[PDB]
Design a protein around this ligand. Structure first.
Ligand SMILES: [Zn+2]
Ligand SMILES: [Zn+2]
Ligand SMILES: [Zn+2]
Lengths: 579, 151, 554
């Protein structure tokens, strides 16, 4: 927010600082010597700095934008499902009428036409998860024999819920035209009593996706997985974590991830190398379990935050690792490109700046992913090939762009702002080329959601203070692509649109209020409201208010920049996008 | 096999794709005629870059993590003379090789910068001593008294 | 014993390999004459007993109670009896069958609800209001959290209550109509445990009527630390490690860091730091006393009597970090247990107890048995590891001190002191080690202690149910392992002693840990990928097939 933090911090203190007998605020000239009215007296040593118009609030501002864009654009917008226990009425079973409607509505052609569409389209995701789709086609065939049975085997119940998770993922990437052609739009809105004029992109495609997730749940609740741990729970949870559900529900997915990690560590299996005396069955089991566990670590990372108490990733991709690099770079490539970003993010919330040697080592291994994704094969028509290709291309460009964002913020290396501008437009052009058929659901993975979450945050945020030409040209395509995101995201999409609106009105708020000099402490509503709202969401994360209800029926007890601050606090309030 | 360089000057330089491989930013943009913005570097500096790519596009290049072939890498005497240029515009050459991730040209210019910085006379180093802040003047007097018998 | 050249050339008492002043003088293979062919001296008494520790964790603690076998492709789901296990037993339990149970814990179990929820009369607010809430049908999530909270204490008050109250409060006959069991019993014959587990499953399905994992609360951990007071963490160890892991996830989601109050806080918060540090200490107790491979996720992270509970269990934390280990606990470390035995032994012996205030008696009896088990297992880890003298003295001593803790607590309002899992594991270790020592170093006082604990375990009721009987078999087969030792001459290759007892003590741990191998259960999770996996020769096959070691999986 506000300190002095100006350009060209000098080398040696002057006489006035030696008189001053405090910390050497070795700026041009000092925030403390200017506070004593002796600004020029600290200037008079040698090479009297430069123009006093370099926006000295801006580095402090970007330091607090780190505080924001950590605690808002992952934590505040997505990872606070601030709901209630008293104000939420109970649901004892309530899916013997609801999930059984999905027992009703599911058809065999409605199963297999999703199944065969998602075969070459999504043939890396389940291939990363489980492998073969024909065994899964066999489970859908026997599933109509395993449909309304009486001898519900626990294992077979996991197989039943497995294909509900598969149907969830098939909804998550099928376009709406084939969805309305394979399924029917109307019996959902018959059963719910909702509107008939609701072609699936208008809200209920992702709801039916969540209903298939919920019917996986309704059988997994019957699987008794807390007394029956197995790997398919974790596999289907990978498949469900591919959806928007971890962002639309952080807390439930946290506990399910907790049970999945407990399930894995029940096995006490770590290494993934088929040694001399190993079973070939155990060999292939370890080979599969490798990608399983690294996708599990990827699921551990995306939900990580203050609602994530139990951690899994305990390794470093550079420089106390557990099984690191004893592993063939095939889909742990997908993990390692994520763990690349993971080690960046132990410096987002904490304002301690990482060593730039580390960041340039990251700049070195950046191109290793860039040209190991080029080290794959290529298939024009197999949609999983270009699908996985664009996934990894997007991930390395995403971490690249965020890395150059970190370069500009933490140290401001050469031309890193223009690097941000360049990689932003390259990624957005990749989205534009995937505005097509066969590639609209290259735009449905939550990586593009969280990526545009950062882009429309910071490009608008730098548009606030620097009315730049390239930032304006990018801001046009920001406002275009914000409306032109796919409907597979839904509620957080509209929360993102409100966030874009509130940041534009935050720009107007900077436009209407001049920044008050008070020696070197600057004052604006942009400062104080963003000071407050993060702490509001932290007090929501201070879950004592959800435990004050747990320890009985107890009830607790807990100027110009006081007015317009507290006018914009409810004018464009954050409470629209908490939930 | 040709891409277009559109600089901050916007002078469209349609160069070869093998020229584009040296710029690892642009070689990544190959995964994204084929235009891209360079909003800071002027196109004469870019033309110097392109002519270096013409010269050493076919040349062989080290692992860029070395010591022997990184720090003790010998210069090109052709690209010594080719970069016997303005001091100022040489820094724009440096910024161009940074901004487009052109590492052996960056090191090649960098070593010539290292040549020009080293070997400067202790006359002018005595003279250009505290141009920047660099010392309290008490220590400046102490240094000048430290060699007082000859200086 | 000093080796050969130590007895031949008369050098220092040197158990080096081969010696530190004989290998140098040109006698390397000449000084390895220290310890198929046979031998029957006490050379095994250093050579063997540390293998017992491998038995002591993985077979007694893990194999007898915690090692659990399931059947995924045959067991029905919870779609069969969705609500009927919950609803029938919610409709049977009436206001007498609630509060008359709750008055057992109100009189007899004061440390438990202070260790979990604070007051039982504060809980009587909800349990009195439960009869305005059993009739409720559209609850909230909070009200169902209260439901599953108080039905956990309804579960707990079944078990520790004796059968004389329990046959009066609960009628036997209408309840065996539901399951189909024998009406003829009185409750203690593995049926009071069964109705306890039925009410446990009622509270668990209320938690499934909660679906607590969406927005969990401290009612989850306060209910689990009540459910974990019985042998339900041993009757359902897979389920208990799962709910314990959910307690780890839930309790740390509330960001509980400090356990002492602070001045700048909410007094609700600063008092709740102690009022949840008690929850933290019982959470650490369930984190510690469920020490198993099925429980991987740990919570070590390091008034005047609830922290004192976790003090002696953290003194036990200095004990059972050497069970699976081949590492010797140092004598300085085994005295660091003993100087803290000096701390928390007389503090236990200063605990106040009144025979009407059975709250205070169980308040005493928790730490009173914990520090005594610290004593016994401490000098037992002197005895097995270092072969320290005057410790079989201490083993037989503190075994009979525990006999005094048990025999003097079968009586009126004291028999539930003999209903806690701490004595269930401790007497298991007594009857394990005493039978084992009677196998190998055959003495009469150890066999007399075996008869003492046989008589005590026969005095110990079948309120523990099916987990009692396997312990009964533990008393049998080990003594027959004595008879397996008595019948075969001990063999070796000169030093490495071989016996049918020795071969069978291998496969005791190997096959039961092979039952603890969940790899091929994961290959069952892979589905279509098929999960495939002299007297020393034949009497091994006799004693393994007849005394079938896999009989402790029911
Ligand atoms: Zn100063
Ligand atoms: Zn100054
Ligand atoms: Zn010797």
């Amino acid at each position: 927010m506000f300190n002095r933090t100006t350009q060209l911090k000098s080398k040696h203190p002057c006489s006035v600082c030696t008189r001053r007998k405090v910390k050497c605020d070795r700026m041009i000239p000092c925030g403390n010597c200017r506070k004593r009215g002796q600004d020029s007296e600290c200037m008079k040593s040698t090479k009297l700095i430069t123009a006093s118009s370099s926006k000295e609030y801006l580095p402090d501002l970007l330091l607090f934008w780190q505080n924001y864009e950590y605690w808002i654009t992952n934590i505040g917008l997505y990872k606070t499902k601030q709901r209630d226990l008293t104000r939420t009425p109970a649901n004892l079973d309530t899916d013997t009428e609801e999930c059984m409607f999905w027992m009703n509505y599911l058809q065999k052609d409605q199963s297999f036409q999703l199944m065969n569409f998602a075969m070459e389209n999504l043939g890396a995701l389940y291939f990363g998860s489980i492998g073969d789709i024909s065994e899964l086609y066999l489970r859908v065939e026997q599933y109509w024999d395993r449909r309304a049975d009486k001898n519900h085997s626990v294992d077979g119940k996991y197989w039943d819920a497995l294909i509900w998770s598969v149907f969830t993922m098939c909804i998550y990437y099928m376009p709406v035209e084939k969805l309305a052609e394979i399924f029917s739009v109307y019996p959902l809105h018959e059963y719910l009593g909702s509107n008939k004029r609701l072609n699936w992109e208008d809200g209920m495609q992702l709801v039916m996706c969540q209903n298939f997730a919920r019917c996986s749940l309704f059988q997994l609740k019957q699987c008794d997985f807390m007394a029956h741990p197995d790997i398919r729970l974790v596999q289907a949870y990978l498949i469900l974590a591919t959806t928007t559900f971890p962002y639309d529900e952080p807390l439930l997915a946290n506990s399910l991830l907790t049970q999945c990690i407990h399930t894995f560590k029940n096995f006490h299996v770590d290494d993934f190398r088929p040694l001399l005396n190993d079973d070939p069955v155990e060999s292939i089991a370890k080979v599969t379990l490798g990608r399983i566990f690294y996708r599990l670590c990827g699921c551990d990372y995306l939900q990580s935050g203050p609602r994530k108490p139990i951690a899994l990733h305990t390794e470093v991709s550079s420089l106390n690792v557990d099984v690191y690099r004893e592993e063939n770079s095939t889909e742990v490539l997908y993990w390692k490109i994520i763990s690349l970003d993971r080690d960046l993010d132990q410096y987002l919330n904490k304002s301690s700046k990482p060593p730039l040697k580390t960041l340039d080592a990251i700049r070195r291994e950046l191109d290793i992913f860039q040209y190991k994704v080029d080290s794959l094969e290529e298939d024009f028509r197999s949609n999983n090939s270009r699908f996985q290709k664009f996934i990894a291309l997007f991930q390395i460009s995403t971490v690249s762009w965020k890395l150059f964002k970190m370069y500009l913020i933490y140290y401001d290396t050469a031309d890193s702002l223009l690097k941000v501008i360049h990689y932003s437009k390259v990624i957005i052009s990749l989205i534009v080329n995937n505005f097509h058929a066969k590639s609209e659901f290259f735009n449905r993975h939550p990586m593009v959601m969280q990526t545009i979450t950062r882009v429309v945050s910071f490009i608008s945020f730098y548009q606030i203070f620097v009315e730049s030409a390239a930032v304006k040209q990018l801001l046009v395509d920001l406002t275009e692509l914000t409306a032109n995101l796919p409907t597979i995201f839904g509620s957080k999409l509209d929360k993102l649109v409100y966030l874009t609106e509130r940041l534009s009105k935050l720009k107007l708020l900077w436009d209407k209020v001049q920044l008050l000099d008070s020696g070197d402490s600057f004052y604006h509503p942009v400062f104080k409201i963003l000071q407050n709202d993060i702490k509001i969401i932290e007090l929501k994360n201070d879950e004592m208010f959800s435990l004050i209800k747990g320890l009985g029926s107890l009830v607790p007890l807990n100027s110009d920049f006081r007015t317009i601050v507290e006018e914009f606090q409810s004018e464009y309030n954050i409470s629209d996008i908490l939930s | 096999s040709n891409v277009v360089l559109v600089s901050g000057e916007g002078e469209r330089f349609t160069v070869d794709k093998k020229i584009a491989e040296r710029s690892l930013l642009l070689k990544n943009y190959l995964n994204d005629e084929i235009v891209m913005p360079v909003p800071n570097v002027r196109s004469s500096v870019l033309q110097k870059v392109i002519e270096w790519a013409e010269h050493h596009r076919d040349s062989n290049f080290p692992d860029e993590d070395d010591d022997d072939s990184r720090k003790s890498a010998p210069v090109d005497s052709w690209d010594r003379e080719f970069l016997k240029v303005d001091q100022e515009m040489l820094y724009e050459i440096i910024l161009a090789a940074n901004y487009l991730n052109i590492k052996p040209l960056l090191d090649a210019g960098c070593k010539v910068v290292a040549e020009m910085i080293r070997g400067r006379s202790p006359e002018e180093i005595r003279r250009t001593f505290n141009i920047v802040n660099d010392f309290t003047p008490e220590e400046e007097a102490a240094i000048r008294r430290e060699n007082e018998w000859a200086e």
